[PDB]
Design a protein around this ligand. Structure first.
Ligand SMILES: [Cu+2]
Length: 77
């Protein structure tokens, strides 16, 4: 079933961006949860990688939004 990946957006607390991004994503294209975690300062989309593609789901966010660095991992303290 649908898995997730993390994505760092170049300007999380721009604001509005994220409302738009919910509107972009929850439309369609293999998503079964949107990213957002602007509260921390990042994105975590839950999707299927077959329809859209892991590069593609990140990459798309560049052209309409902002620099979207993909992170198929999470670690820190
Ligand atoms: Cu913005």
């Amino acid at each position: 079933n649908s898995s997730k990946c993390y994505i760092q957006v170049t300007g999380m607390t721009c604001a509005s961006c994220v409302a738009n991004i919910e509107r972009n994503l929850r439309r369609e294209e293999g998503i079964y949860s949107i990213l957002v975690a602007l509260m921390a300062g990042k994105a975590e989309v839950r999707y299927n990688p077959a329809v859209i593609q892991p590069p593609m789901i990140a990459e798309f966010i560049r052209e309409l939004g902002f620099g979207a660095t993909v992170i198929e991992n999470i670690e820190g303290r």
